[PDB]
Amino acid sequence: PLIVPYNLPLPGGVVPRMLITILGTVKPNANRIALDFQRGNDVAFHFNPRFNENNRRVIVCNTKLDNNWGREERQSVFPFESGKPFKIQVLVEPDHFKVAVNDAHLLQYNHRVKKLNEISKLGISGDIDLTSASYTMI
Ligand SMILES: O=C([C@@H]1O[C@H](CO)[C@H](O)[C@H](n2cc(-c3cc(F)c(F)c(F)c3)nn2)[C@H]1O)N(CCO)C1CC1
């Protein structure tokens, strides 16, 4: 187990068939979680479960370029629960990030940042206890 926030190094960036697994438990009174795949100061892929946005649960995904957030992609499907252990898996494909939570497909996010081999850090933050963060090649 690790104390958030935590940065997982992705040396030489990401590549298709790279599978990132994040294990943790959502805190009992959680408001938000974020994964940030970073290319320097840019955020290639921000994955942001929000537990109370206007009293609704939503997944917000976005990219940050030159310190500006772009067009949000939102999902109503919300697989997380306060207090409960989770597994987030991010599969890097040639054209998108694929996300599954607790072994169920959640969403895919088209690559806006094209230089996958420069996406060299994964930031993990928010209202979780972080158990582990690792990757393998499938
Ligand atoms: O609220 C936002 C921003 O939306 C952006 C995506 O469009 C980011 O989510 C921004 N964000 C979240 C976090 C964050 C999240 C966590 F879970 C953390 F634990 C943590 F430490 C930080 N850091 N930046 C967010 O301020 N907006 C209003 C409409 O959605 C958009 C900008 C117009």
From Swiss-Prot:
Residues 6-136 form the Galectin domain. One of its GO terms (biological process) is negative regulation of extrinsic apoptotic signaling pathway. A major expression is found in the colonic epithelium. It is also abundant in the activated macrophages. Expressed in fetal membranes. The keyword Repeat applies. The modification Phosphoserine is found at residue 76. GO terms for cellular component: cell surface; collagen-containing extracellular matrix; cytoplasm; cytosol; extracellular exosome; extracellular region; extracellular space; ficolin-1-rich granule membrane. It is found in: Cytoplasm; Nucleus; Secreted. Keywords: Acetylation, Cytoplasm, Differentiation, Disulfide bond, IgE-binding protein, Immunity, Innate immunity, Lectin, mRNA processing, mRNA splicing, Nucleus, Phosphoprotein, Repeat, Secreted, Spliceosome. Transmembrane segments: none annotated. It comes from the Eukaryota. The keyword Acetylation applies. Coiled coil: none annotated. GO terms for molecular function: carbohydrate binding; chemoattractant activity; disaccharide binding; IgE binding; laminin binding; molecular condensate scaffold activity; protein phosphatase binding; protein phosphatase inhibitor activity. A beta-D-galactoside binds at residues 69-75. Probably forms homo- or heterodimers. Interacts with DMBT1. Interacts with CD6 and ALCAM. Forms a complex with the ITGA3, ITGB1 and CSPG4. Interacts with LGALS3BP, LYPD3, ZFTRAF1 and UACA. Interacts with TRIM16; this interaction mediates autophagy of damage endomembranes. Interacts with cargo receptor TMED10; the interaction mediates the translocation from the cytoplasm into the ERGIC (endoplasmic reticulum-Golgi intermediate compartment) and thereby secretion. Galactose-specific lectin which binds IgE. May mediate with the alpha-3, beta-1 integrin the stimulation by CSPG4 of endothelial cells migration. Together with DMBT1, required for terminal differentiation of columnar epithelial cells during early embryogenesis. In the nucleus: acts as a pre-mRNA splicing factor. Involved in acute inflammatory responses including neutrophil activation and adhesion, chemoattraction of monocytes macrophages, opsonization of apoptotic neutrophils, and activation of mast cells. This is Galectin-3.
